């Protein structure tokens, strides 16, 4: 018996930046972060599109994407300085080399899945947020 999700959540805490960080979970699968001693430019969380169970011990959180296809990414969170966090998305080829890093400082943007890609990662980065409630994000095809 499986429950249907339109959106991608934080998932498990493993691999969240935890130096000085409390992370609280709620029944709606949202997550609350707090870290006063936190400078900018650190990777809070990363979501992966392919993982090995033995190392990850979760399932991947990102969907398979089609090479050369355009996608709409939508983040949904409440941050106290509205720019307390931003996003970067990184594309890796079959051999693990970076093809491309996008940085976006807004909650809705459009990206193209690069033609040589094989895996990719979405990261949230810090910019001295006081309060962050993270709800979810999503990645949808564009006609």
């Amino acid at each position: 018996i499986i429950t249907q999700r339109q959106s991608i959540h934080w998932g498990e805490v493993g691999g969240t930046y935890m130096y000085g960080t409390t992370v609280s979970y709620y029944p709606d699968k949202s997550v609350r972060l707090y870290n006063p001693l936190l400078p900018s430019g650190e990777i809070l969380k990363t979501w992966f599109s392919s993982v090995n169970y033995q190392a990850a011990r979760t399932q991947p959180q990102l969907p398979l994407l089609k090479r050369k296809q355009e996608y709409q990414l939508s983040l949904v969170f409440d941050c106290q300085p509205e720019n307390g966090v931003y996003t970067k998305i990184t594309f890796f080829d079959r051999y693990g080399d970076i093809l491309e890093k996008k940085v976006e400082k807004v909650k809705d943007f459009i990206f193209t899945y690069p033609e040589d890609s094989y895996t990719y990662r979405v990261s949230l980065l810090s910019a001295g947020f006081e309060s962050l409630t993270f709800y979810h994000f999503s990645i949808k095809e564009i006609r």
């Binding site: 493993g14 000085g20 409390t22 992370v23």
Partner: protein, 129 residues
Amino acid sequence: KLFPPTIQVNPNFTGAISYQGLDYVSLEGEFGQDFAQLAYWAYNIMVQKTLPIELWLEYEKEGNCDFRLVIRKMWSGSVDDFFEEVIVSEKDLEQALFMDSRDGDYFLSISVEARGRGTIKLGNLHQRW
């Protein structure tokens, strides 16, 4: 050691889940009348062939509740079979837990069962010679 963010929480637990740094994960609420799995370590500890291990659990607890560990031992290459299950009590945890070397390398997978009501702060799971 195994940091508290390797601990995953059982989905039936209805209470408060909070991870504080790499110090502890705090579970606060109703744990049930009898011992029932609250949390578990998602990663395994390996005990190698000539290298005996002893384990320490940093923790602290509050309220009318109790917890225990269930340690399960798996040969290298076992997928689903355990050869031992060891209930560890809170008093057992006042001392290090001895895991002896064996003829093959084996792995541990460790549950936290709890009953009662309160706040359990599971901390670092230490491993030494």
